[PDB]
Curated annotation (Swiss-Prot), chains A, B:
Boundaries of every Peptidase C30 domain copy: 1-306
Side Cytoplasmic, residues: 1-306
Known function: Cleaves the C-terminus of replicase polyprotein at 11 sites. Recognizes substrates containing the core sequence [ILMVF]-Q-|-[SGACN]. Cleaves and inactivates human TRMT1, preventing tRNA guanine(26)-dimethylation of tRNAs. May cleave human NLRP1 in lung epithelial cells, thereby activating the NLRP1 inflammasome pathway. May cleave human GSDMD, triggering alternative GSDME-mediated epithelial cell death upon activation of the NLRP1 inflammasome, which may enhance the release interleukins 1B, 6, 16 and 18. Also able to bind an ADP-ribose-1''-phosphate (ADRP).
Protein name, entry field: 3C-like proteinase nsp5
Summary of activators and inhibitors of this protein: Inhibited by pyridone-containing alpha-ketoamides compounds 13a and 13b. In turn, alpha-ketoamide 13b (tert-butyl (1-((S)-1-(((S)-4-(benzylamino)-3,4-dioxo-1-((S)-2-oxopyrrolidin-3-yl)butan-2-yl)amino)-3-cyclopropyl-1-oxopropan-2-yl)-2-oxo-1,2-dihydropyridin-3-yl)carbamate) inhibits SARS-CoV-2 replication in human lung cells. Inhibited ex vivo by michael acceptor inhibitor N3. Inhibited ex vivo by compound 11a and 11b.
Source organism: Severe acute respiratory syndrome coronavirus 2
Subunit structure: 3CL-PRO exists as monomer and homodimer. Only the homodimer shows catalytic activity. Interacts with host FBXO22; this interaction promotes the proteasomal degradation of nsp5.
Documented effect of changing residue 189 to A: Does not affect ability to cleave and inactivate human TRMT1
Part of the full-length chain shown: 3264 to 3569 of 7096
Gene that encodes the chain: rep
Cross-link (Glycyl lysine isopeptide (Lys-Gly) (interchain with G-Cter in ubiquitin)): 5, 90
Reaction equation(s) it catalyzes: TSAVLQ-|-SGFRK-NH2 and SGVTFQ-|-GKFKK the two peptides corresponding to the two self-cleavage sites of the SARS 3C-like proteinase are the two most reactive peptide substrates. The enzyme exhibits a strong preference for substrates containing Gln at P1 position and Leu at P2 position
Amino acid sequence: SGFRKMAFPSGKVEGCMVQVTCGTTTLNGLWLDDVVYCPRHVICTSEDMLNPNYEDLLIRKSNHNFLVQAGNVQLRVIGHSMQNCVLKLKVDTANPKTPKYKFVRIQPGQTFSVLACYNGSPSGVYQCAMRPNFTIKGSFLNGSCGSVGFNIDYDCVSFCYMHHMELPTGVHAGTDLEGNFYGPFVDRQTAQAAGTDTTITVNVLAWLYAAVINGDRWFLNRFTTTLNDFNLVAMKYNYEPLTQDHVDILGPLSAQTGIAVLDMCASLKELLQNGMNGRTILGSALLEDEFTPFDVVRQCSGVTFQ
Amino acid sequence: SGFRKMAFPSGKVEGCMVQVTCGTTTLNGLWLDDVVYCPRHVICTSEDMLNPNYEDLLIRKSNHNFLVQAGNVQLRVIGHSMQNCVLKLKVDTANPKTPKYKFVRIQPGQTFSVLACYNGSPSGVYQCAMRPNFTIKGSFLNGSCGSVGFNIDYDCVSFCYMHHMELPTGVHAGTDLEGNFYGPFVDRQTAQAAGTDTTITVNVLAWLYAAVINGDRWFLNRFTTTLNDFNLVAMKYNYEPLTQDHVDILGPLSAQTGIAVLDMCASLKELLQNGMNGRTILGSALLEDEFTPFDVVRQCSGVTFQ
Ligand SMILES: [Zn+2]
Ligand SMILES: [Zn+2]
């Protein structure tokens, strides 16, 4: 028992991080097969960040102007195209450490692990949520650009995020591994606004089920509710709408705990409507939305061998 | 900017985990050099847990009754002694993956990363605190015995914890790598009580300094206080005593932020004495004590290369 915000083990990823220097400007890259991937703004410096003309910048400092090191200066750079906001470095040799991997684009509310890196070496790892408004509330200092997010479980890494920028509020923004930003952001540094950030309701409910399995049961209803009256209330507190798709992904948990989804939904309301009381649930005085239903189950039925 | 409960990258540790089976009973072990380390209770089964006679148990199921696998059945077991609560398996070959490592015993209030493992393969990683009363509030299911905790930064692993038991309340208890329990616990399953758990005051204060560096400044005093009047109050809320040693480890942070320790101390009081208001600080509606002063600094001045 107990319950912690757990990250995936980072081993299969630490061996894929390199550094990329192009001029000054040196950041982290991702070395899979014979390709390094990294933020394309590694080709910029100063007032370039204000309005970069990426195509004009990239046609001048050539292939030998890019240094990629894996644990020492010695990868040969013999190619380059720009895929969206990502650079792509055709290089000399495969990584003798490249794990089984894949590139995925994930949806708001899903979680993943970030391996925070600075100039090519791992700093730490934490688990977080892609927010409804396509930002992440990360922990990034200067030099961590190119750090990646991923999911495991299986034999592999599913890569889903590359870090690109800090917005003027402390929030973080980045791309998939095809260089398409999540959300309406661009790799420039003028003025960029994200969402109202809403609470990921299906994740709160999944977390309430984890609390019941842990024996933190004081908040339980008995009441019930309609999915309409629920969603009517969820909203005026900036909780995203629960739908039938959400109800279905939660059924495994309903089955374990003997608590129907609509009943838990009825329980969430009173926490929202009436009080929380600064009673605690699973360590926290608020409500928690960075655990998916799969994350919570990831403990009964899947984390190692038969 | 931003601030997350970060764990150390787990790569150097994933390659040191094996499984150990001895009869039935199969758990995780730690393969360094030519030695596997694991909880000695891997030699028990049923009502053995009630009062194990470890010396009597161990003199019968011999060296070939122990199977140790690293990513496949094939390590040869040719030796064994019992060091305290830890088994110690003289085996055939060195691990071709053994990192630079060391064994350390740490003090209450210090933090480390746990690599939760089930039958020899990594499940996830999280960062936590050794509580004043020598327990940890972990996340462990059956089969995770032998999972280890560690600190990195450097070139290595500092190993500080091996998981042994869940107490009847959900709290967790274990040993150093010399098999000496942290706290007054024994690897038996009768009745065992731990502390009143107190709050790690020097860690709360370090976390308040992280909040100021992040720009979460609403709670700041200006007032001041005496170390006596502070400690008088800290206590009746079950906060451990701040001492001059604590004040000294915090000086680097005081210097960065321009806020003297006694002034932050004066600020902590009002949070304790008057209200919190369910205003938030750095994500949390409470106060947070699983970040050390070193953890908080670990971001300005040390996490990669020059
Ligand atoms: Zn950058
Ligand atoms: Zn056990």
